Structures are given as C-alpha cells and as structure tokens.
C-alpha cells in the first residue's frame, strides 16, 4: 500500500500518470518534498536532467528512470525536461518543485543582507568584541520535524558542521568533545547541504521525523580576532 510516488507508463514491456495526463504532449508535473517520480519509457538521448530557463538523486535504468525530489532549493523555477518517445509520438516531462520559502533555523553571522537563505536568528560577528566568545542560541520543540538548521559564517567554522558537531557545555568541570551528528541526535536520515556566497560559508542539515531523545549541540564560527558559537536544542516527545 504505497503512496506519494508517481508512475508514468509510456511503454509496453502508486499514482499512475499516462498519455492522457499530458497537455499538447507536455506534462507539467509538480513534485513535492520527498516525493519520488518514476517513468518507464525510452528517452530520446538516454539523458534528461538539465536546465530549461537540480537533481540530487537520479537513477537511469533501461527503459526506466527514477527521480527523488530534493528537500532544499532556492531556485524559483529550476526544471528538468525529460524528452521521451512512445509510438510515433514525442512527449516531454517538465518536473519542477513547489516553491516554498524554507526558513533555516539558525544564526546568520554574516553582514551581507542580499543572501539567498533566510535565518531565524542572526548575530553580526563583525560587531562582536575581539577576543570574545558570544553565543547565539536556537531551540526546537515540535512533535514531528521538517526543518533546516544551519549557519552562515564569514570565516572558519568549528568543527566541520554539521557532519561533526560540538558537545554541549557541562555544568560540572567536564570536557566537551567533537562527535558525528549521526550518533548525537541518533537518527539515520540526515541530509547535509553546503553553499558559499562570496566569503560567507553556509552549512546546514535537514531533520525529518521525531527524534528519540531531546538533544543539544554547538557549532563555532570565528572571523579574524572575533568569535561566536551557535547552540542548538531539539526536543523529543
């Protein structure tokens, strides 16, 4: 009993889409987050994924192509035009994700305001004291999660976030170490994303579902003699 996926039977030998669903031999299919598109037809040039005025995962098999829609994108209308053939007809499939302004739950330490990304919190590190260490806290407490957590650091980051993260602060005199985010939040499906706007590096990760236990971690951002750190806290149950 599956759902979400879309199947395009355009050959001979689950929402089913066929020739009837085309308009003037065009299929303006609008994919959603974590939605798997499937087609079964002999493509013209054995290839599709391009620009037409971004494929995370595409598997090309004989007379069959599987595509999973990505979870984060900033392009308004980034499309893919699978041009196929069946019988004596030529059909084209235009895939495009639903435009949604996903707001990154994190701290923008940079000062540029013409960024392609939107952060819930922000702290211009360039204004911070030299030889200082200011915090920018971030918290989450939803039953189910579908969020993007990251930061925009104009300088070096510590550690490699968010594949590696920094353990939370100890009340007693105990050390805090660097761990892999996989083990820290104790889930499997962790998407990772990286981007760069000039000197500003921006690294983030996606979380989907409900976490096992309420967990917290930290990521450190330094620029010249100034420094800062973002503390994240996600709640279970």
């Amino acid at each position, epitope marked *: 009993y599956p759902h979400n996926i879309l199947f395009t039977n355009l050959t001979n030998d689950p929402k089913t889409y066929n020739e009837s669903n085309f308009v003037s031999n065009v299929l303006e299919v609008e994919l959603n987050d974590g939605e798997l598109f499937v087609l079964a037809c002999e493509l013209i040039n054995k290839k599709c994924f391009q620009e037409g005025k971004k494929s995370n995962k595409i598997i090309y098999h004989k007379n069959l192509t599987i595509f999973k829609a990505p979870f984060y994108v900033t392009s308004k209308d980034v499309n893919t035009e699978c041009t196929c053939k069946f019988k004596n007809n030529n059909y084209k499939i235009v895939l495009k994700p639903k435009y949604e302004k996903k707001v990154i739950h994190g701290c923008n330490f940079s000062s540029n305001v013409s960024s392609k990304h939107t952060f819930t919190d922000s702290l211009d590190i360039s204004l911070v004291d030299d*030889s*200082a*260490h*200011i*915090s920018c806290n971030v918290h989450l407490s939803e039953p189910k999660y579908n969020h993007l957590v990251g930061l925009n650091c104009p300088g070096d980051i*510590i550690p490699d976030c968010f594949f590696q993260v*920094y353990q939370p*602060e100890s*009340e*007693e*005199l105990e*050390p*805090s170490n660097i761990v892999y985010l996989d083990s820290q939040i104790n889930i499997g499906d962790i998407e990772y994303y990286e981007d760069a706007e000039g000197d500003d590096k921006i690294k983030l990760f996606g979380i989907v579902g409900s976490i096992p236990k309420t967990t917290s971690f*930290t990521c*450190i951002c*330094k620029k010249d003699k100034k*420094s*800062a*750190y973002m503390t994240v806290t996600i709640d279970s149950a």
Partner: nanobody
Amino acid sequence: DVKLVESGGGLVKLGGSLKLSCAASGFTFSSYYMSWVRQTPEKRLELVAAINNNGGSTYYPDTVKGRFTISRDNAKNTLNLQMNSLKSEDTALYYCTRQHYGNLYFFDYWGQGTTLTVSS
C-alpha cells in the same frame, strides 16, 4: 587587551604552604574558565587546577587533589590558588591561563608566570 598577571611565587620550605594570585584585565572575567598550569624544569606543561565561569565546580588532577585549592573573586577579577603541603616535585613556573566553552576550551591567553621553588 586581555591581560593575566600571576603573583606571589617564591621559595617555600618542604611541606609549607603558599597562595598564588592572578590579576585579570581587559575582558569579562566572569565568562571564562580559568586554570593554573605549571611548567616543570623538564619543560613539560601540567594542568594544576581549573575552575568554571561562575566558580561553582572545580577539578584537580589526583597528583595535587586535596593539597591545592583554586578560587576566584569575579568582583575583583582575581584567581587564587592556595597550595598546601608543598613537595619538591611542585617546583615549577605557574601560569595563569583562560579557556571558554565557545572556543573549544582553547588556552588563548597566558600570563608570564610566577616561579615556585620548593626546597629546604
């Protein structure tokens, strides 16, 4: 500029006791982990004692646990270390250094040190 000034070091006879103080200036003393670290004649570095930002919890390695006692007066921007029952092995140059959870407990500032000599 951040500044840490150790003081109070000298010659102590075997088994004696001495208090070393550290003056801090140029930063929010209350937001940083302070620590005393000493350098042996063998030129090795050893953590003597450490304290948290609010002065609540402290740690001492077993080598000096119970003998020495770290303390901090955030109102006066001072860090004190009362060392008791000093042994000859404690002869070292004692540094006053800082850390912050927000810099991965990095010793980014150290004083010039005060020299302790434990001999009869």
